[PDB]
Write a protein that binds this ligand. Sequence first.
Ligand code: CL
Ligand code: CL
Lengths: 31, 31, 31, 31
Amino acid sequence: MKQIEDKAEEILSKLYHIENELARIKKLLGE
Amino acid sequence: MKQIEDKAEEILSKLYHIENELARIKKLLGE
Amino acid sequence: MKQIEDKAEEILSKLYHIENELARIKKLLGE
Amino acid sequence: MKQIEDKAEEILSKLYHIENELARIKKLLGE
Ligand SMILES: [Cl-]
Ligand SMILES: [Cl-]
């Protein structure tokens, strides 16, 4: 459970990374 | 635990957003 | 909990979708 | 529950794979 929250956090932190990599690809293609 | 269900919701919702990003990308590539 | 498993399943099913959309973009760019 | 922790692991691992896809993409775009 405290380990669950650690894994939740890693999961969110990967999910913002991915959002953000994707946002930068969309920006580039749209240039 | 509904804290854990809460987190799963928050997860999916991020994944929905990610899928919208990729729908924009795919259009910009004419898919 | 049975609802947790439902949300897990949706989460996996979005994650394979995303993997797969991404695999098809990589294929296209690499052509 | 370690079934739930198990699932979270399986989640992250998919997200790692997704990040590898996007590293290939980004290179193909010369980022
Ligand atoms: Cl939901
Ligand atoms: Cl892990």
